[model samples]
Target: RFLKVKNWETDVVLTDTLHLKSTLETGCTEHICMGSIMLPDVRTKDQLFPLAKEFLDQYYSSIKRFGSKAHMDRLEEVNKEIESTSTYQLKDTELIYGAKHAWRNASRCVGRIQWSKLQVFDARDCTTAHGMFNYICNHVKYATNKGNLRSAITIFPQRTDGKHDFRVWNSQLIRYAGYKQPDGSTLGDPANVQFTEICIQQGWKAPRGRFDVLPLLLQANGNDPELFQIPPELVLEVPIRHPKFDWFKDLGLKWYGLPAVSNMLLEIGGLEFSACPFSGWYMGTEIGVRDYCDNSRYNILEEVAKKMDLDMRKTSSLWKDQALVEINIAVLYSFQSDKVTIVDHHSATESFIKHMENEYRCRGGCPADWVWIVPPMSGSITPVFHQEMLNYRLTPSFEYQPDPWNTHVW
Candidate 1:
């Protein structure tokens, strides 16, 4: 039952008679699954009208009136507007409803139970980089709320003709700088090395610390992206310490409290918000497993194992597994000690099951990516691991977009 296979990739590739396809090809028929990929291309041309009409229909139905006179009038208004201007504007109420629905439609999120509770900050009129910075700062301040993290999203201008796009260059609203040392070593988080270099090139003075907060890179009106440092008071940091182990604090591990995803595009009613940054509380495994223990990330497992005096020479001892538990314990304890909002994997998974039930009763089915919905650690033991799910596209959703620098001049 406990067997370790060597050269698994080589063996599979050598013996496998699977179809070869590009990453762009969606394997709908062949059943070759890229279950992790979740991008739908931006819609185009005259197709926008029907898409908008479908969403408007859904929106009116949500408000208890599917085809009332007001709904018909609104649809006609949008049709005329699109016919004249090639695009239609969403009212403030529509924007609020759309943002919440987008959160509810996010297939990757485990905390979608609080979808309707999100505070939407509308910044649709923002036209300058400085104005964007101010709006972002307010978002950070409001969402942080001194550690009692609130679910929130700040919607910037929608994409119109893609000529004057508004964008936030950072993947998250807050991230640590990863400085590449001269001797091929990394001084901070390894995940952010390139972004750190980019910030430095844009005239940010490097503080050269283990966890220096990177500045906000803002782009507005198709212009160059600008860097603005986040206010220290607005950012909340939690120091990791174990409840049982007093020496755990000596490791000097810390993480930001808020999980504000900044780069995802929010699609609603055939409209695309190119720079909608959403913030929510963290899941313990997000910090303990991926952020800390991922070899590509902090890689703190070995260090924790050594500190615990566990035998490191053999896999039979399960030193890494022991370290994982304590590290995850430390993450939960630290966040609780600091009064920051966080969820443990088991609790989050259970809540997600409830959410799935709610979604099924309301919409007949929920589109869930099993790979994403399942917890990274202790997969088989969790309830989600036993459940089968179907993954499908849902509109009024958050989507992965092209990097701002990928298609534009720096």
Candidate 2:
């Protein structure tokens, strides 16, 4: 038996060396090998010559661009080594067959064209040819799947190369992805809800010109609610510019609180009576009880008069010389709008008291229990301005009868 040994890392080297040694020792160099022993074969000229030319052109172009001094030297050395080999001479049929086989294999490996290395007689011609070829290829693939042979053949006449019509190919791919149904219906059926006439009137034009018309025709038939609400977050209020205030800068007020003086009067707890202009009031037993209990301990009216240094009951044309009474009243002058159009503090308070008493009587309550007073022509009084002699002493800037149009006026 022969000794068998294996070196894991250098197995290829060891195997080659042993084969060479055995071939030399046995004088059988032609029969020694460690790999596949299949002989190279040659094919047709139609497949071989063009492929050989393409390979030579590509290798020459690559070497012209990236070949360095060291690389060129190494390549020359490799050429020299190859020339020294006994099998390098093209002497007989074996050499010719080997050369043809090498050419075929090289052609197969270098089949692709790089765009950067391409040369065209005319740029536009190149573009048009490529586009037409891509279009035809795409249509062929689409027709194969669609089972439409006539359409496919009519589009792709020559099957020499894979190049065909690009535009047609792109369209076929879109249609195959359920973009159009088999019954010639589009995916979303946008036509039924579409306003094409309005679009035309609005001077709208199709992006892809007539090519889009076929897809639009294929769209399904139905009215879609989604079309009605295309833009979901449309604004209801049209933006407008205000003359006095910068409306844009003051947009915050549309959803936020207004200035402090804008709210002056405090009304019945929940009811906003500031904007209510009518000579009526809410008179309830609860109101009477609350007022009586509050006045007995606080003497609120007297305290308020003392604080202001005026008899509140006697000073005004309304609510004169009446004993302290408990009543819920409101005096309102009606306006077309609900917002407060005028400001009259005294009449408003007095009318409010009188309306409360009247409401109380109508509710089967006694007059002594609640009475609200309102003097005639009380609403007609214009506001008065008081100027004291000592006012100027506090500040030299004091000005009486100030211009009403001035922003400084309250």
Candidate 3:
């Protein structure tokens, strides 16, 4: 008897297609609206209020001529709104001074109220304001990109002085020498190293009125940190202890205390062994063993075996017969107390059959015990083949199905 089930009776079948479609569409629309409408246009009333107040104050007298009582009332209303809406705390003296200035500028205009003050705002000031606006916009953009906007607005007011003001912001810059190899030469790509500097104005003191070197990568530290006291140079090298490898010590290689160089080596080594097939020739088997013996005192016998297994598969014509097959057989078998390093000639001759069995099992899910008869070895003393046998006690069954082989595989 065959198992029969209705198409709709499966637990995997998803319902609520309408709800799913609605949710997806709504989400997409909201995403677009966030970038176009909310983010680019978003501004705090406090930020806008200053500009608005400045505009109104600059043209107050002409506004008063167009019905003086009404204009005065309107001006007072806007001024009051500006005072309440803005977070800027204007002192009593400053407020009196600003009001007098506004009154004097306004009375000069008489019948014609000049609104050019609003239009004539300097690019620097606009940049400061728009920089803040764009910064807020970027926050919203980042929030939308991350799919988390719940606390997005709280990511506002990044700096009190508009954009990222690195000069006034107390931050430390650390500089170090480039890495040196055992041979006293630089070890890694020089482009990756970051250089930082602070260009001080000729007459300015150490801390005040000084601008940080622009476009330099900066690291902000809250505590009182040490400054980079070294002079600007192409290379900075610090001595370190040799890594736990025989080749490193044997070559008289000194530890170069450069994080960039060390990190690059680690990254390159990991990727080479894990992913690159041709890497066994260079970084994995031969080179790895050679480097191990030449550089440091670490026991790398175990690492050698693992590398050999991978290297053999990569070099063998058998790998290209149908598909490449590689296994950590040496590692698996070496786990026992009596570990074998070199295989005998006879064992090597019989290894093909064992490899075939592994390949069959991997490809077809064949039982390990299923034996197939192989041709008897001639000339040399090799193991004879035995009759084929299906060692499975219970054979699994399957329905007839079309093969789904891709054209690319063939």
Candidate 4:
């Protein structure tokens, strides 16, 4: 019913509203809820052998070969390697399987229906930052597929102890630059203000526009990160336009078709790929509600309301609701019109329910953060909003890591 999580660094306690069996503690208690708080980082310490063995067992069982001779041998091999060198390598097959399973294991993603469909690119051979960029470009080109977006992940070099690690500083492969104005307004995504500053400090010329795409900041072997501009043609962008309103096109908003998240640690079999950039197509509400209507983001509700001639002066007018619906409609329509891959929240959430059934039947339960699984807009209408979900950690997993700047010494 409740979970309690404590921040290791700050020691601040919080609680998430709910859970069940297989539910890892997420800091929620019956007295209060911290459903929005992040899970504390608690990598299992001094148990590499057990950790690696546990994941391999899960992997073998997933392939329906739990405790088989091959599985047992491989487990022994991993143990031997870790015992001697303090690390082990995942075979290409193992790597791809782990990547897909990591997507399936993710509690935050609602698009787990496409978990087994990921196209994994093993970029562990990449040795230079330039090479990293090239691999990333390949990932983008292949995944974009002329707007028939493919789910994909490019696994860069694995972490070799703490001294040498590769990392992508950009949270997403494609993001708009944010510029703070003297009037206390942000021109683009205010969420990216600090990252935008980093790009500027790295000598990237800011176009100072609303939708200018950010360049990649790739760090190799714990070195100072290098900046590389993504080729414009390689990026497929959709111009937002409402199907019924011609004037809506005048807003001139654009979003990249591919949502490649680059700044997560993909951990598999007790090893971490610190620079694995994975991507998928968009969910319409992600752009509509979060990107556009969020007050801290583009803050476009007022403008859209003005265009619609809504009575924005009062809360009872429901101007925000109407404008939000139109924006979501526009986002979905524009992407479909442009022949880009995007999903309406209704269908996406519906499919997530199907995915939950599959996971439950096969794995006994699905770990889903209800706060995230429910759509930001039209919450009560989505199937996930009504379902009681359990939130927990499973591996291999795509985990949020500290900002590169926070750990990287100059």
Candidate 5:
């Protein structure tokens, strides 16, 4: 397993497809930073400019519009505070800017053009697991917006005390439980096997069947994580069914209301926040391509391939490809039918290309991972496949944090 740093380098690509971790680092001029703080030992000019650039790009409007001297002084103070403070204690403006800028800087996301619209809920004072869970439940409820789906984030307390670090153990606020059957098969999401095991072993009751939504497991100050089930009323799940096939619902496939990722760290300026969870509307392919079709996860491709009656006898028949397109179509159409927020690959790719153009006009360049920027299905069809991109590590960015179960509890 590759190490997951609090401050992930730009070259690194992260995914939850197989619970696999790998690091990709290029030899280009790199800098040393731990979490969000640049260390003297690994300091370089190239290393520091990206974070500085983000702050300037975001705050430049204020200076030009109002000649806000206090804003200028705040920026100077922020620069000065980078190395000294554990929590950075951002101003209210800085908090909003960081949340928006983090979405703009997210390499994999295609909905970043709406970065400015993300609703920021500040819960930096939250010091208990139950409190964190409550904030998360609230975030899900608001982001759901009765299926209008607003992009949102809830920031918990950063680790200012040397000994106490708050954390959310679940990758997202909503995920299905996976039960390990005696026959060596997994019942629900195969990807969540270990996570489900942890919650059950930690004393949370498991449902008797598959497709059960897992609860939030949270910890504070290195304390043991607590389990808090999301209220059924707050969650909005889409029942799976294809546009043509009526029997597809019998498969009992479903997913949660919002894909609110709760475990990622948000690094702004020099401070690192571990309990920050943020989400946007999902791309149709994320659910259809990875969650339902990935081999190690649900392993549904062959099942779907057979149902579509595509000549499954040969890989050359492209049965899987055919089924994949239909599955994705169902996802898009299902969410649309449910009045939920979901983006098709073509529209999402279009939006991202627009974001790139806007970034170029505003900040000169955008950092993006080509493989991630390209949709899993219809790769060459999307404009991003033909477009070249430069990926690099930048501050004011969101990063996948390591699992809380990996370490000792307080």
Candidate 6:
């Protein structure tokens, strides 16, 4: 029988002497540990080499701006170490650049105009659930900024070699609770009910409410995950109400302050950081149209149409269109009232085209997907409407990773 450490750790030394029988295979002798517990040999790489090269390039550029050092020597050392070492640990500055550029290169983000303004918090040294939880709490407090929200990204340790991963399992750092009813109906966000159940089964003490904020499930390397609830004060939410309709407040709609996406990989230089949680000030339609009006989400369009006495029965009547416009306006007005950062669709789309033009002169090309660049509320009426776009892969980017609970069974 054999036991494998996912990436590895051990105590007690070898009581017996080790042997290297073959002369030609001895270059990696130091890596062959003779511990009391057997270890699965550290895996290797064509992947890390290119990533290491990418890092060196970025490192050189950064250092050159300030006045370079014997950075070349360190670059070689880093490459060699990565070729054999259990992990490649990026420095704080490296983490910061990686995150900033990742945001800059996100093709689907209309908010890329503020990409350079992202505040990066480096927590790459954290190796335990409690440590990650503490970091997350701090990130939330600072990022929420008491309703004066700032664009921020907090990077946890990279999932490298065979190491156990660390991550916020939620789609966003803050999200509403979705409860699945006995009859298979849902009380809150239907998309999250499955995730909510996963949390409960893993031993979270949920309040059993429609809008209870879900806790973060943090997993340290090779350990069972733990539950940490966020403080209520840290999460600023805007309660939704239409300008003309006083009864809209009775609908009890609300959303969190920070739209921090947590489960996406921040690929920098060339290395993949699976635990990087990043945020931007939301474009109004994100909360207004997609989250509140999407069929699988809140699906509030039909209700709003009914209240406005619009004909939902006819396709040409554009009842959904009217309600969508009003809903988005309320979202913009509500955030403005609360002194939070949010952008309207018109301003946001115009800024996106501006960003595209700027990037066109800076980089050889600006890679963007058309469908996402168009606003959810009024697609054809925006500047991005007539603009043709194409999606292409770019390095140092933010990308979707698998669900955090998706563990290897084999």
**Clash tally, candidates in order:** 0, 23, 14, 9, 2, 0
Q: Candidate 1, residues 1-410: lDDT per residue as tens digits?
A: 11121222233111111111111223365656676654433456488998898789878988998889999999999999999888989998889998998888766788899999999999999999999999999999989898888988999999887878899999999999898878888888999998888889889998999999999999998789998988898899999899999999999999999999999889888899999999999999999999999999989999999999999999999999999999999999999999999999999988987777677657655666788999989987777776666555667888788888787765
C-alpha local distance difference test of each model? 0.84, 0.22, 0.24, 0.87, 0.74, 0.73
TM-score of 6: 0.84
TM-score of every prediction relative to native: 0.92, 0.12, 0.18, 0.92, 0.84, 0.84
* C-alpha-based local distance difference test score of model 6: 0.73
**Looking at candidate 3, what is the lDDT of residue 289?**
24
Write candidate 3's Cα lDDT for 1-410 as tens digits.
11111112222211111121110111124235322221121236555454444433433433345446755665567567546753233333322333332212221111111111111111112223223233323332332232211111111111122222211111111112223247654332122122221222212123211122112121111111122222223112221112322232232222111111000000010011000000000101111222222222222333333433333345453322111111122211222112212232235335533433342443221111211212111213433132121212111110111111110111
Writing each residue's lDDT as its tens digit, candidate 6 over 202-290 gives 88777887788889877767467788888888888898878887767777888877888887777775566778777767889899999
Residue 7 error, candidate 4, Å: 32
Candidate 1: segments with Cα more than 4 A from true spot: 1-27, 36-45
lDDT for model 1 comes to 0.84
Per-residue lDDT of candidate 5, residues 299-342 (tens digit): 78888877777799888988899988888888887898999988
Clashing pairs in 6: none
| Candidate 4 off by > 4 Å | 1-25, 29-33, 39-46
Q: Is candidate 4 or candidate 5 better by TM-score?
A: 4
| Candidate 3 Cα deviation (angstroms), residue 174 | 4.6
- Provide the lDDT at 277 for model 6: 78
